mmCIF file of C-alpha atoms (C1' of nucleotides) in Angstrom:
data_model
loop_
_atom_site.group_PDB
_atom_site.id
_atom_site.type_symbol
_atom_site.label_atom_id
_atom_site.label_comp_id
_atom_site.label_asym_id
_atom_site.label_seq_id
_atom_site.Cartn_x
_atom_site.Cartn_y
_atom_site.Cartn_z
ATOM 1 C CA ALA A 11 37.193 -27.838 -70.061
ATOM 2 C CA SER A 12 38.330 -29.630 -66.890
ATOM 3 C CA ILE A 13 40.449 -27.679 -64.377
ATOM 4 C CA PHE A 14 42.538 -30.104 -62.337
ATOM 5 C CA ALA A 15 42.804 -29.337 -58.632
ATOM 6 C CA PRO A 16 46.047 -27.650 -57.589
ATOM 7 C CA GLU A 17 48.751 -30.070 -56.408
ATOM 8 C CA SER A 18 49.218 -28.194 -53.159
ATOM 9 C CA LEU A 19 45.534 -28.882 -52.505
ATOM 10 C CA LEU A 20 46.116 -32.593 -52.941
ATOM 11 C CA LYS A 21 49.100 -32.484 -50.560
ATOM 12 C CA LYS A 22 47.118 -30.548 -47.956
ATOM 13 C CA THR A 23 44.159 -32.911 -48.311
ATOM 14 C CA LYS A 24 46.374 -35.934 -47.691
ATOM 15 C CA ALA A 25 47.890 -34.239 -44.638
ATOM 16 C CA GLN A 26 44.505 -33.148 -43.313
ATOM 17 C CA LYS A 27 43.053 -36.631 -43.912
ATOM 18 C CA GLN A 28 45.878 -38.202 -41.871
ATOM 19 C CA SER A 29 45.486 -35.711 -39.009
ATOM 20 C CA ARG A 30 41.744 -36.319 -38.922
ATOM 21 C CA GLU A 31 42.396 -40.087 -38.688
ATOM 22 C CA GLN A 32 44.558 -39.647 -35.578
ATOM 23 C CA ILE A 33 42.003 -37.285 -33.982
ATOM 24 C CA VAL A 34 39.149 -39.747 -34.502
ATOM 25 C CA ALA A 35 41.286 -42.732 -33.500
ATOM 26 C CA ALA A 36 42.303 -40.900 -30.307
ATOM 27 C CA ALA A 37 38.665 -39.875 -29.713
ATOM 28 C CA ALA A 38 37.145 -43.314 -29.447
ATOM 29 C CA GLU A 39 39.974 -44.241 -27.074
ATOM 30 C CA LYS A 40 39.315 -41.023 -25.103
ATOM 31 C CA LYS A 41 35.621 -41.983 -24.683
ATOM 32 C CA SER A 42 36.485 -45.465 -23.420
ATOM 33 C CA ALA A 43 39.149 -44.168 -21.006
ATOM 34 C CA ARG A 44 36.803 -41.486 -19.738
ATOM 35 C CA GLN A 45 34.082 -44.050 -19.023
ATOM 36 C CA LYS A 46 36.555 -46.301 -17.161
ATOM 37 C CA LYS A 47 37.986 -43.307 -15.269
ATOM 38 C CA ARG A 48 34.552 -42.048 -14.218
ATOM 39 C CA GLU A 49 33.655 -45.465 -12.780
ATOM 40 C CA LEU A 50 36.894 -45.407 -10.834
ATOM 41 C "C1'" U B 1 26.921 -8.608 70.482
ATOM 42 C "C1'" G B 2 29.467 -5.737 67.358
ATOM 43 C "C1'" A B 3 34.169 -4.175 65.709
ATOM 44 C "C1'" A B 4 37.238 -3.284 61.788
ATOM 45 C "C1'" C B 5 39.012 -4.687 56.987
ATOM 46 C "C1'" U B 6 38.554 -5.211 51.471
ATOM 47 C "C1'" A B 7 36.895 -3.430 46.686
ATOM 48 C "C1'" G B 8 33.908 -0.042 43.969
ATOM 49 C "C1'" C B 9 30.623 4.124 43.155
ATOM 50 C "C1'" C B 10 29.284 10.082 45.083
ATOM 51 C "C1'" C B 11 30.599 14.676 47.478
ATOM 52 C "C1'" U B 12 34.198 18.424 49.856
ATOM 53 C "C1'" G B 13 39.276 18.903 49.434
ATOM 54 C "C1'" G B 14 31.133 18.132 20.210
ATOM 55 C "C1'" G B 15 26.221 20.327 21.003
ATOM 56 C "C1'" C B 16 21.213 19.540 22.608
ATOM 57 C "C1'" G B 17 20.155 16.990 26.521
ATOM 58 C "C1'" C B 18 20.489 12.398 29.666
ATOM 59 C "C1'" U B 19 19.656 9.779 35.579
ATOM 60 C "C1'" U B 20 16.190 1.975 37.642
ATOM 61 C "C1'" A B 21 20.680 6.546 31.674
ATOM 62 C "C1'" A B 22 21.298 8.645 26.478
ATOM 63 C "C1'" G B 23 26.686 7.492 32.752
ATOM 64 C "C1'" C B 24 29.947 3.302 34.360
ATOM 65 C "C1'" G B 25 30.890 -2.599 34.544
ATOM 66 C "C1'" U B 26 29.781 -7.331 32.568
ATOM 67 C "C1'" A B 27 27.003 -10.864 29.321
ATOM 68 C "C1'" C B 28 24.033 -11.550 24.957
ATOM 69 C "C1'" U B 29 21.787 -11.234 20.433
ATOM 70 C "C1'" A B 30 20.235 -7.460 16.304
ATOM 71 C "C1'" C B 31 21.775 -3.327 13.316
ATOM 72 C "C1'" C B 32 24.985 0.964 10.744
ATOM 73 C "C1'" C B 33 29.417 1.497 6.845
ATOM 74 C "C1'" A B 34 35.715 2.344 4.416
ATOM 75 C "C1'" U B 35 39.091 3.366 -1.348
ATOM 76 C "C1'" A B 36 39.272 -2.733 3.109
ATOM 77 C "C1'" C B 37 37.202 -8.313 1.819
ATOM 78 C "C1'" C B 38 34.105 -11.269 -1.782
ATOM 79 C "C1'" U B 39 31.329 -11.954 -6.857
ATOM 80 C "C1'" C B 40 30.711 -9.733 -11.672
ATOM 81 C "C1'" A B 41 31.571 -6.080 -15.657
ATOM 82 C "C1'" C B 42 35.211 -2.662 -17.959
ATOM 83 C "C1'" C B 43 40.275 0.043 -18.546
ATOM 84 C "C1'" G B 44 45.341 -0.560 -18.709
ATOM 85 C "C1'" U B 45 50.109 -3.069 -17.540
ATOM 86 C "C1'" C B 46 52.726 -7.561 -16.880
ATOM 87 C "C1'" U B 47 53.134 -12.906 -17.567
ATOM 88 C "C1'" G B 48 51.934 -17.465 -20.099
ATOM 89 C "C1'" G B 49 49.654 -20.008 -24.380
ATOM 90 C "C1'" G B 50 47.497 -20.576 -29.465
ATOM 91 C "C1'" U B 51 47.469 -18.965 -34.549
ATOM 92 C "C1'" U B 52 50.271 -20.419 -42.553
ATOM 93 C "C1'" A B 53 50.491 -26.482 -48.158
ATOM 94 C "C1'" G B 54 47.027 -18.876 -44.737
ATOM 95 C "C1'" C B 55 40.906 -25.141 -44.833
ATOM 96 C "C1'" U B 56 34.137 -21.014 -47.033
#
RNA sequence: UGAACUAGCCCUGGGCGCUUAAGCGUACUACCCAUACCUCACCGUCUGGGUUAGCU
């Protein structure tokens, strides 16, 4: 009755989740550096 | 008082027309338009880059 998600989907989701974390982490830093650069 | 000299125009030796030019010299602003220059679109060629746990 319950169809488990494919295991390749779980592996891709873990990889995509990690890549999104780096993008967001390097996006808040990008905003701060841009504000400091623009003042300079 | 003149004398010559110097330089330049005139005479003798594309068409229509032009004469303080529509010729010649110089200066100055306007204007005309090439397949050239600029901006854009499109064609093609070349060069460089991206694109797969193929993510509704």
